[PDB]
């Protein structure tokens, strides 16, 4: 049982985690300005 | 009728929505500086 969807899916989850980290940092910078 | 393109496509739309949210926040920070 082999599939390539799960590895690229895990890459999608970790890049989405990096996106949420960037969103958290931008909310932090918006709080630092304001 | 089964396909894996729609679920990764919906993941693409929601990450693109997060990208547009990051772009909106960066335009907001550019307006806050200027």
From Swiss-Prot, chains A, B:
Coiled coil: 1-34
Highest taxon listed in the record's lineage: Eukaryota
Reported modifications of this chain: N-glycosylation is not essential for but facilitates cell surface expression, multimerization, association with lipid rafts and ion channel activity.
Tissue specificity: Expressed in dorsal root and trigeminal ganglia. Specifically expressed in a subset of pain- and temperature-sensing neurons. Not expressed in heavily myelinated neurons. Not expressed in neurons expressing TRPA1 or TRPV1.
Disruption phenotype: Trpm8-deficient mice have severe behavioral deficits in response to cold stimuli.
Free-text function comment from the UniProt entry: Non-selective ion channel permeable to monovalent and divalent cations, including Na(+), K(+), and Ca(2+), with higher permeability for Ca(2+). Activated by multiple factors, such as temperature, voltage, pressure, and changes in osmolality. Activated by cool temperatures (<23-28 degrees Celsius) and by chemical ligands evoking a sensation of coolness, such as menthol and icilin, therefore plays a central role in the detection of environmental cold temperatures.
Subunit: Homotetramer. Interacts (via N-terminus and C-terminus domains) with TCAF1; the interaction stimulates TRPM8 channel activity. Interacts (via N-terminus and C-terminus domains) with TCAF2; the interaction inhibits TRPM8 channel activity.
Domain notes: Cooling agents bind within a pocket formed entirely by the S1-S4 helices that opens to the cytoplasm. The coiled coil region is required for multimerization.
Protein name: Transient receptor potential cation channel subfamily M member 8
Organism of origin: Mus musculus
Taxon lineage: Eukaryota, Metazoa, Chordata, Craniata, Vertebrata
């Amino acid at each position: 049982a082999n599939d390539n969807s799960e590895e690229m899916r895990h890459r999608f989850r970790q890049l989405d985690s990096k996106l949420n980290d960037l969103k958290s940092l931008l909310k932090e910078i918006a709080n630092n300005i304001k």
